[PDB]
Amino acid sequence: NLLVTKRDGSTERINLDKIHRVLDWAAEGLHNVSISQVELRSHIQFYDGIKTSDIHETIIKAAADLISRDAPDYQYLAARLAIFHLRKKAYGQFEPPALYDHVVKMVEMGKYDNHLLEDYTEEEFKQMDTFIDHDRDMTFSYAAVKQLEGKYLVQNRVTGEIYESAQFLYILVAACLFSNYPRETRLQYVKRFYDAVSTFKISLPTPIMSGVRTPTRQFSSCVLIECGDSLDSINATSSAIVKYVSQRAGIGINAGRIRALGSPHTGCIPFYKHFQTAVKSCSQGGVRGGAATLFYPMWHLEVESLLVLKNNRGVEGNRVRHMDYGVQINKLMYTRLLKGEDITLFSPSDVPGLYDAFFADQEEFERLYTKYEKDDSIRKQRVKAVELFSLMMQERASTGRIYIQNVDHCNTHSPFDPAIAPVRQSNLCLEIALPTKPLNDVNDENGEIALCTLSAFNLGAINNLDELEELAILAVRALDALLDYQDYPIPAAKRGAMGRRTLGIGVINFAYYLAKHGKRYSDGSANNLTHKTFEAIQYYLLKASNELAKEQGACPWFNETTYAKGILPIDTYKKDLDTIANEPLHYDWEALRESIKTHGLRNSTLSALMPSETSSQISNATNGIEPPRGYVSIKASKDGILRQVVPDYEHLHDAYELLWEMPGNDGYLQLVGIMQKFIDQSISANTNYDPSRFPSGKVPMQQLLKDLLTAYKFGVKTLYFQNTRDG
């Protein structure tokens, strides 16, 4: 017996065999999945006259629940069942419509931006539809589908209906970004990019994937704003933060210039607190969403108050708990620690030229520093370098989020002439390293706000390193096109973007790649392959940007790059790197060098290694450069537990080095240093600690500091989270 409520109201006999036929289709090709197991699990939940939608999400979920490391292909069974449902939900059948027809409807409904129909003719669409392979929807893992369905696919947020499917998202992302190209190359570039993305070679940030092809022109995910030492600037910064967190951008705030408490007055913290409410202005119940990382030098007079800003037990005025902090450090300071000496704390306002030099010129810093320490007309405060470091190290440890920026490494090993366009801060997750100028007022045309235009190569989807050439052309070009496509809430933002056209392209799936070349993080066994891999990335990237400058002109301010001066990443990297790898450079950096000097680069920076969370779940890939905590990863959702097994777990379980089995941090840090050699910006590098690996379960300060030192020694620009296992 048993009935079924159809899509609108009609009611038919339960078609048991339609269901079964769908599952058999879904299980096609897979291994170690029982169809009847899924059926027994889901059938027992059916009730007379159950909705048709519910038959679907039941069988979907029944499959999802069987996802395990012993049966990884349940993630594919579930995916395909979910895919099939979403087709019917958007199209009322599995067969998707023709591209043109779909796009037309979509403009009628005002969900796609109608310049798509403006910029392309009917068989320009006709053609693109032949580029499409709707079968690639079958390659997604269940977790990936849940991500697509959650936050990529155009859908009504109220009613909950889904309007597109993943392939259209991809083809249409490509069509918009390349909408400007000459007729000769345009559909040729579109086809090629679509392919790179549909087959997971290139990942793109969530705003870009969910937004481009819709009527929006905001796609920004993170900004950097530098705050001057004035109420005008303080206000301006704050205003710019509001505008940006309102678009859900992640904020990076340099705030170290603000003068100390008692200066000829009430000091930093009240203003930080203000930057915080700003960052929180469009969030949740004022607590959840919109994050920021705020930066200051180590030697700032207020530093001991600043470091404990996230500490639980304090007074209210003592604490600004809902932002992360980046302590800025240079060589001199470390030397004070090792030489067991003092660090002097100065209010910026009281020490002319010191702040500036901190970033741009170490030699001068060392001079101005030693002078001012001596000159005792100048307000100062001395602290024991061990003590000061310990404070910083323990707050970092307890909160997991006091970060470190090596400001010398960010400037001696930068694409920017430190003297013209210093890098004096990072973004929220410490991979972005670009020039910034304070603002007079929200609309000051002379500020610079840096933003992050991001992408990534899936190292696990490339068959070999030379694939990165055409991938690097595709990636750099599409991002460069977006730079012109999107809009800028603040003029200072626009200037950085247009001035220096800065890109941050990185990697996902690194651990998987390492696993399958049979290497590990912890033992040094990867140092060379890493060196080879990142020489390949940086070279192909710079090359792609180079011929784009040939084609379209170097970025307006290309002249403030070391690149313009013929200086390359390979000239200025930290030397000790020689002691840990010895792969030869395999490409002609000298041919490239010369070409750069001649035509310039379209982009001032090309590479940054960001963390990914969403990008990498969608491709079933390990997250950027991170090793996986375990083999199966879990998230909550209001659809049950989403499990995702690591790529090729079947053949690679012993090849992975899961995060916590690394004996310590050195191997990893060496790989990060080696990456840094070629990376224009920085890397979201972590330090991890498992307490159960130390006497009486406590991580000793000695260790915390040795790893900090190791990081610096290998020229590591920033240091992001510190993880501490528990139990």
Binding site: K331, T335, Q702, K706
Partner: peptide
């Protein structure tokens, strides 16, 4: 707690 004595040995 820290030993500054081996610390110093380190090369930056």
């Amino acid at each position: 707690e820290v030993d500054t004595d081996d610390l110093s040995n380190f090369q930056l």
